[PDB]
Structure formats: C-alpha cells, structure tokens
Amino acid sequence: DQHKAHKAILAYEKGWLAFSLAMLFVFIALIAYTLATHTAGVIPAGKLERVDPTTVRQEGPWADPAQAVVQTGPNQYTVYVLAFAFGYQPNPIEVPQGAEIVFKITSPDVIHGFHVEGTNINVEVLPGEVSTVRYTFKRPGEYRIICNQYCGLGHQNMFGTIVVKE
Amino acid sequence: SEISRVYEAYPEKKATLYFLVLGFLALIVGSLFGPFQALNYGNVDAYPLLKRLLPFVQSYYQGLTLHGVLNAIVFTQLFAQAIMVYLPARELNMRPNMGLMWLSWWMAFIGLVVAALPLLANEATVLYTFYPPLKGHWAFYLGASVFVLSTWVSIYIVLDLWRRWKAANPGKVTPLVTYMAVVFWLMWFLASLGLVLEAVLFLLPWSFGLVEGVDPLVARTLFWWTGHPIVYFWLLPAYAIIYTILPKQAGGRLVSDPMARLAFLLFLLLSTPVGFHHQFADPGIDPTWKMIHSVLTLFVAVPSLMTAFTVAASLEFAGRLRGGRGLFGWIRALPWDNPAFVAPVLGLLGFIPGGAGGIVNASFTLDYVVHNTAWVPGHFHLQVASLVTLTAMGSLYWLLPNLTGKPISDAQRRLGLAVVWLWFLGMMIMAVGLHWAGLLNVPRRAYIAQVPDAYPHAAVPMVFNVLAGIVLLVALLLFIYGLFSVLLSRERKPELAEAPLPFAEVISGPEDRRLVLAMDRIGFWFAVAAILVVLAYGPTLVQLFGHLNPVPGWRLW
Amino acid sequence: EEKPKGALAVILVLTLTILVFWLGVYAVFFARG
Ligand code: HAS
Numbered sequence: 001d002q003h004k005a006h007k008a009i010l011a012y013e014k015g016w017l018a019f020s021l022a023m024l025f026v027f028i029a030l031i032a033y034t035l036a037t038h039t040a041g042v043i044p045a046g047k048l049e050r051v052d053p054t055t056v057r058q059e060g061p062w063a064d065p066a067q068a069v070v071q072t073g074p075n076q077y078t079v080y081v082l083a084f085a086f087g088y089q090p091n092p093i094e095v096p097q098g099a100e101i102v103f104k105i106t107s108p109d110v111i112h113g114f115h116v117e118g119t120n121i122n123v124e125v126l127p128g129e130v131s132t133v134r135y136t137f138k139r140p141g142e143y144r145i146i147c148n149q150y151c152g153l154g155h156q157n158m159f160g161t162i163v164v165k166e
Numbered sequence: 167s168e169i170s171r172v173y174e175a176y177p178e179k180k181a182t183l184y185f186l187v188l189g190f191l192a193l194i195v196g197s198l199f200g201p202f203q204a205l206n207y208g209n210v211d212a213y214p215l216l217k218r219l220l221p222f223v224q225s226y227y228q229g230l231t232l233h234g235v236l237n238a239i240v241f242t243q244l245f246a247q248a249i250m251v252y253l254p255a256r257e258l259n260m261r262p263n264m265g266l267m268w269l270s271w272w273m274a275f276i277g278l279v280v281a282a283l284p285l286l287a288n289e290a291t292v293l294y295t296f297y298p299p300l301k302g303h304w305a306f307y308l309g310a311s312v313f314v315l316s317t318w319v320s321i322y323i324v325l326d327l328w329r330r331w332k333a334a335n336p337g338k339v340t341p342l343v344t345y346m347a348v349v350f351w352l353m354w355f356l357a358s359l360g361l362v363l364e365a366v367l368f369l370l371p372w373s374f375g376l377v378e379g380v381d382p383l384v385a386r387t388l389f390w391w392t393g394h395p396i397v398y399f400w401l402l403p404a405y406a407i408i409y410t411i412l413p414k415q416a417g418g419r420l421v422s423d424p425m426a427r428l429a430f431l432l433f434l435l436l437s438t439p440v441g442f443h444h445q446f447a448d449p450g451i452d453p454t455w456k457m458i459h460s461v462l463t464l465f466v467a468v469p470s471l472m473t474a475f476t477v478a479a480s481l482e483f484a485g486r487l488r489g490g491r492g493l494f495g496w497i498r499a500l501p502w503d504n505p506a507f508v509a510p511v512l513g514l515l516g517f518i519p520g521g522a523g524g525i526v527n528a529s530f531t532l533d534y535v536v537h538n539t540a541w542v543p544g545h546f547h548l549q550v551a552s553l554v555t556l557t558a559m560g561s562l563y564w565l566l567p568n569l570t571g572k573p574i575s576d577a578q579r580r581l582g583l584a585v586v587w588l589w590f591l592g593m594m595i596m597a598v599g600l601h602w603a604g605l606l607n608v609p610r611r612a613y614i615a616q617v618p619d620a621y622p623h624a625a626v627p628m629v630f631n632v633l634a635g636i637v638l639l640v641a642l643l644l645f646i647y648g649l650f651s652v653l654l655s656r657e658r659k660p661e662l663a664e665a666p667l668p669f670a671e672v673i674s675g676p677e678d679r680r681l682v683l684a685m686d687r688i689g690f691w692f693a694v695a696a697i698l699v700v701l702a703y704g705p706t707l708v709q710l711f712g713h714l715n716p717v718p719g720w721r722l723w
Numbered sequence: 724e725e726k727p728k729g730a731l732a733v734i735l736v737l738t739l740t741i742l743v744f745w746l747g748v749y750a751v752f753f754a755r756g
C-alpha cells in the first residue's frame with residue numbers, strides 16, 4: 001500500500017493515456033470519413049465572399065426573392081437567401097428534390113442562424129459576409145428554418161420554410 | 167486598529183474575502199434569472215411574474231444577458247482571483263503585494279458597477295458574447311474591459327510571489343499549488359490577448375462613436391481566442407481545489423503530484439489555440455484550420471481524462487483508508503456528511519456526461535447536429551454551473567471559516583447538504599431536458615415560451631425543464647438563506663481562522679523528480695504555448711485583418 | 724494494497740458515456756446527411 005501502490009498508479013495512468021489517445025484517434029478517423037463524403041457540403045465555404053449589408057436587399061442577387069433560385073447546373077440550383085431581422089427571404093424557398101442545393105446566405109443587419117430542421121444545414125449568417133453551404137435533400141416535404149442565433153426581441157419568432165418539391 | 171488583527175498579519179484574507187463575497191453576490195443575482203429560464207425551456211412563461219418583482223427587467227433577453235454576464239463572467243472571474251492568489255500565497259507563506267491586490271479588487275468593483283448600470287438600464291442587451299454588430303452602451307464595454315483587465319494585476323501578483331519565493335529558495339522545485347497558479351495565470355495572459363484586442367481595436371472606438379462599424383467575423387474570432395481558454399480559467403480553480411484540498415477533506419492524499427502538474431502544463435499549451443471549435447459554423451474560415459483546431463480540441467480533453475483517473479484513485483485511496491470494502495465500498499466511506507466534500511464530488515459526477523458532450527461538440531462535423539441548440543446549455547450547465555459553481559459553494563465550508571472565523575454550526579452544515587443535493591439534482595434534471603430538447607432542434611438563447619405551439623415534439627423533455635426550474639428555485643433560495651446565514655450569524659471568534667487551508671499530503675515515488683524538473687522549465691513551455699497560438703490563429707488573422715469589412719451597428723431590443 | 728479497481732470502474736463509466744454520446748450523435752449526423 002502507497003509508494004509500492006504509487007508504482008501501480010503511475011503505470012495505470014500510462015495505460016489510460018494509451019487508451020484515451022487511441023479512442024481520440026478513432027474519432028479523428030470517423031470525423032475524417034465524414035469530411036470525404038457528400039455530408040461534408042454542410043461545411044461553410046472557406047473563401048471570403050464580402051458583401052455590403054446596407055445595400056444587399058436593394059441591389060444585387062439578394063434584392064428580388066422571385067429571382068432567388070437560379071439553376072446553376074443540370075442538377076444544381078443556387079439560392080440567394082437573405083436572413084433579416086425577423087424572417088427569411090424567400091419564404092418559402094422552393095427547391096427540387098435530388099438537386100445539389102447551394103445556399104448563399106447573408107444579412108442586412110445583425111448575425112442570424114440558419115438551421116434547417118431535419119438536416120445538418122447549420123450555418124451562422126454574418127452581415128457583410130456570404131455563408132455558402134451545399135446540401136441535397138433526399139425527401140420531399142417541408143423543412144422549417146430556425147434562427148438559432150440571438151438577434152433581438154423577435155428572435156424566438158424568426159422561422160422560414162424550405163419546400164423541396166416531390 | 168483591527169480587533170480582528172487578521173487583516174494586519176494575514177490581510178490577504180481581507181482581499182480574498184472581498185473577492186469571494188462579491189463573486190457570491192454576482193452568482194445570486196445572475197442565478198435569480200436561472201429558474202425563469204428553466205421554466206421557459208419548459209414551455210411555461212413566468213416573466214409576467216418576474217417583471218413585477220424586478221420591475222426594471224424589460225425582457226427575457228435582458229434577463230439572459232444579466233444571467234450570463236453576472237454568472238459566467240463575473241462570479242467565475244472573482245472565484246478565480248480569490249482561490250488562485252490565496253492558495254499559492256498560503257502554500258508559500260508569503261504575502262501578496264497588497265497595494266496591487268486592493269487595486270485588482272477595485273478595478274473589478276469599478277468594472278461591475280460600470281457595466282451593470284447600462285445592463286439594468288436595458289442599454290446593452292447583447293448577451294455575454296456581445297456579438298457585433300449588436301451595439302451595447304459604451305459603459306458595458308468599458309466595464310467589461312476594466313473588469314477583465316483586473317486579472318492582469320492578479321497575474322503580476324502571482325508571478326511576483328513566485329519570483330520572490332524562487333529567490334529565497336535557489337534550486338528548490340516550485341511547490342505544487344503555486345506551479346498550478348503560475349501556469350494558470352500565464353495561460354490566462356495568452357488567452358486574454360484576444361478579447362483585449364477586440365475591445366481596444368474595435369469595441370471601444372465603435373461604441374464611443376469613433377468608427378461607424380466593426381467586422382463581425384474578426385470580432386467573433388478574437389472573442390473565441392479568449393472564449394475557449396476562459397472556460398479553462400473557470401475550471402482550473404476548481405481543479406486546483408479538487409487536486410490539493412479535496413483528497414484531504416476526503417481522508418486521503420493526492421496520489422500523484424507530477425500527474426497534477428502534467429494536467430496543468432497541458433492546459434497552458436492547448437487551452438488557447440482551439441477557439442475555431444466555436445466557429446465550426448462560421449463563413450470565411452478555412453475548413454482545414456477548423457480540422458486543426460478540432461484535433462487540438464480533442465487534445466485539450468486528454469488532461470481532463472487524466473484528472474478523472476487521478477482524482478478517482480485518490481478518492482478510492484481515501485475510501486479504503488476509511489474502511490471501504492468492495493468494488494464500491496469506498497464511495498460510502500467518503501465523508502458524505504460534509505458539504506465541503508460533497509459539493510465538488512457531485513460536481514465531478516455531473517462532469518462525466520458534461521465532458522462527453524463537449525467531445526461530441528468538438529468533433530467538427532458533429533457540431534452541426536447540436537450547434538446553437540439547447541444541447542449547448544445542456545453541456546455547459548454540467549460544467550460551469552455544476553462542477554465549477556459547486557466547488558465554489560462547497561468552498562464556503564472550509565474557506566470562509568478560514569478567512570473569517572465564524573465556524574459552521576450543525577444546522578449550517580445540514581442546510582449546506584440540502585442545497586448542494588438539490589443544486590446537483592436540479593442540474594442533472596435540467597441537463598436531460600436541455601440535451602434532449604437540443605436533439606429535437608430547439609434553439610438556444612430563445613424566449614420559446616412565447617411560441618408555445620412551436621416545439622411540440624419537445625413536450626416531454628419540456629416537463630423535465632419545469633421540474634428542474636422548480637427544484638433549482640428551491641435550492642437557490644435555500645442557498646441565499648444559507649450564505650447570508652454563514653456570514654451574518656454573530657460568531658466573531660479568534661483561533662480556527664489562523665488556518666492554512668486543509669492542503670493534502672502527497673504520495674512520492676522514484677519517477678517524480680525528472681518529470682517534475684522538466685515541467686518546471688516554465689519560460690520554455692510558455693514560449694511553446696505562445697508559439698502554438700501564433701501557429702493556430704496567425705494564418706487566419708492575417709487574411710482577415712487584410713480584409714476588414716466593417717458593418718453598421720444595430721440595436722434590436 | 725493492489726488494484727485501484729474503483730478508479731477503473733469510474734473511467735469505465737466515463738469511456739462508455741463518451742462512446743454512447745459520440746456514436747449516438749454520429750448516427751444522428753448521418754440520418755440528417
Ligand atoms: C467551465 C466550463 C466548461 C468546461 C470545463 C467545458 C469543457 C469542454 N467543452 Fe464546453 N464546448 C465545447 C467542447 C468542450 C470540450 C471538448 C471540453 C473538454 O474540456 C471536456 C473534457 C472533459 C472530460 C473528458 C470529462 C472528464 C471527467 C471527469 C474529470 C470526472 C471524474 C469524476 C469523478 C472522479 C467522480 C467519481 C466519484 C465518485 C464518488 C464515483 C465545444 C466544441 O468544441 C463547444 C461549442 C459548441 C457550440 O456549438 O457552440 C462548447 C461550448 C461551451 C459553452 C458555450 C459558450 C457559448 O456561449 O457559445 C460553455 C460556456 C462551455 C463551458 C465549458 N466547456 N462550453
């Protein structure tokens with residue numbers, strides 16, 4: 001007991017670093033896997049794509065919610081989504097099923113969140129920057145957009161809709 | 167002058183006592199919003215009630231700001247200034263410089279006072295992360311700045327103690343508690359660079375009217391430079407208490423001094439270069455850098471997995487010594503009738519799922535499942551409001567006697583144990599509901615009681631949230647009564663306060679001194695720490711500071 | 724004495740909690756991917 005059992009403790013400690021490290025690496029591995037597949041398109045684009053918040057809903061690709069979905073390949077569509085003090089334009093976003101959807105989201109005011117219930121889409125929207133995420137919806141139906149970043153008194157009420165067509 | 171001659175042989179008790187009292191006062195007020203918020207996540211609106219008790223409260227989100235700023239920033243910082251100055255001072259029997267210590271306290275008081283004014287005036291309802299371009303009163307940023315900056319005076323105070331003690335003992339190894347304190351204050355110095363740079367460059371000139379706006383991506387990247395390590399600044403005081411005090415109150419020894427040193431050394435290295443894990447969902451920050459900060463984040467949990475075994479085995483050793491018998495004999499041999507001991511051990515239990523949730527959160531792509539849902543508060547209430555707070559509540563039992571004199575009566579020990587078990591139990595119950603409402607996509611930071619039809623899939627973990635609101639309301643109230651009662655009840659008594667804290671004897675072996683020697687090259691490791699920071703934030707900040715996109719400020723409350 | 728059995732059982736609980744939580748959310752991720 002004790003000192004004799006001190007040798008045991010600094011040795012069991014060695015096994016536990018050994019084991020902790022191996023399980024942490026298996027996680028690193030299983031993340032890696034998600035990084036190499038379709039699921040990875042929810043990661044925001046690296047590049048800085050700057051815009052001007054005070055202009056963004058008057059001039060440019062965000063100023064007309066009618067013109068928010070553009071077909072940008074045979075099976076690809078781009079959607080200019082504006083997240084604003086207390087809703088989303090367009091409402092609804094109307095996207096086909098099976099298509100790569102490329103969201104380009106910005107704000108004219110403060111930070112908002114864009115969390116699409118039932119998907120991994122979960123990006124912060126920053127006034128002056130463009131959040132670009134990619135996703136393919138495999139199931140038609142409605143998907144509520146939640147704003148999950150406090151933005152003011154109307155926050156708990158900021159929701160949107162994706163309608164992805166049968 | 168003092169007939170409590172205390173504060174002229176050890177006046178470092180006088181300062182410490184002010185740090186703790188003010189910190190526990192912040193906890194009480196900040197926490198008063200707690201149960202209201204728990205019932206909100208329970209789909210019961212109770213702000214019509216609160217607004218009539220506290221007529222100054224304009225909204226749920228003013229509540230959440232005050233709750234956040236007052237609990238997570240202010241109580242915790244003050245608990246850290248107290249513990250991490252006074253424990254190393256006592257281990258070394260030296261006096262902290264008192265002109266500076268009274269300054270640090272004054273800088274923190276002037277700070278809280280100044281920040282608190284616009285918060286109660288509803289002029290800075292921007293949450294404790296104050297994300298631009300939400301714009302607070304200038305007095306909130308200047309308050310938080312001076313309040314934060316009072317930790318620099320504390321860093322000086324401790325390195326000074328260390329310099330002087332080394333001078334008097336050439337070739338002696340830094341004693342354990344002091345070693346902890348030193349890596350800890352050095353780690354906080356690196357850490358705070360970020361939030362300091364966000365204030366001085368951006369936030370302060372913005373809100374005085376000196377520039378029209380701020381880049382939110384940089385403001386948020388500087389913030390999280392400080393924002394992750396700041397949780398380790400909350401945790402390590404408790405870890406300090408847990409490593410060097412708890413085992414003695416438990417009957418035992420710390421089973422390893424190098425182990426504990428190692429843990430702390432590892433927090434100096436890896437606590438700061440990891441804040442991109444709060445930005446998994448930000449634009450304009452390269453996916454590759456997120457993968458680095460993610461691997462590095464998983465490394466910051468290794469010291470903690472070590473603490474788990476090290477603490478566990480110390481408790482086990484104590485337990486056996488106190489007649490504890492089988493696989494699990496040793497748990498009921500621990501002093502369950504002492505709140506000093508119970509509060510941090512319950513904290514540790516809560517810590518098990520709290521840490522497993524952080525690991526999930528840290529795993530980059532897995533953070534898309536849970537980011538900004540109720541799951542996150544689920545996670546941190548298990549960490550800070552449970553372990554860190556409970557180690558502070560339990561402190562009151564062995565530290566307050568030590569500082570004041572006033573001994574704990576049996577009915578005070580008893581109320582202690584009610585509080586601590588109810589606090590623990592309320593937190594576990596709140597954790598489930600918030601973890602579960604999170605996986606059902608309920609957002610954090612929301613007055614969801616105003617949209618009561620909105621999250622119908624969440625009806626049942628919403629009952630859990632109500633249940634806990636009510637438990638934690640009982641416990642907070644039992645605490646307020648208990649805390650005021652430990653201070654107020656007239657026991658202005660002599661002896662038992664002439665006390666060095668119940669520090670632990672430690673087990674020694676042949677493989678101590680070579681490890682301990684290496685880890686004591688503090689200048690070396692701080693440089694490695696500062697190099698890891700540059701290598702982790704540097705590439706990304708160069709790009710951003712070259713591409714500043716200031717945007718107008720908004721007030722949305 | 725010999726084996727710090729207790730401590731091991733603690734880190735066992737730890738590990739298992741960690742796995743249940745991590746593998747649990749890893750499945751949620753794919754089911755939403
Ligand atoms: C004081 C506070 C906190 C601690 C400590 C903490 C620990 C971790 N967290 Fe966290 N956290 C995250 C990852 C981690 C990781 C990897 C750890 C690790 O350090 C944890 C390692 C811990 C363990 C591996 C547990 C070890 C277990 C022990 C030590 C128990 C032993 C028990 C015994 C001995 C009892 C036995 C006794 C008997 C009697 C049986 C991530 C992701 O990377 C996010 C962002 C999520 C998002 O989307 O924003 C995050 C967000 C937060 C938020 C949000 C801030 C905001 O407003 O956005 C709060 C403030 C917070 C606080 C704290 N966090 N965390």
Ligand code: HEM
Nearest residue numbers: 197200201203204234237238293294543551610611612638
């Ligand atoms: C007193 C019992 C408590 C209860 C019932 C309680 C309840 C809650 C709930 C339900 C939330 C989530 C609300 C939301 O995100 O909208 C929350 C937020 C929070 N709590 Fe507590 N809490 C308590 C104590 C504490 C303590 C002691 C601390 C810190 C030491 C703490 C720190 C925080 C922080 C930092 C937030 C998030 C602030 C933000 O998102 O802006 N809580 N609390």
Ligand code: CUA
Nearest residue numbers: 112147149155
């Ligand atoms: Cu937009 Cu919350």
Ligand SMILES: [Cu+]
Nearest residue numbers: 393394443444
């Ligand atoms: Cu963090």
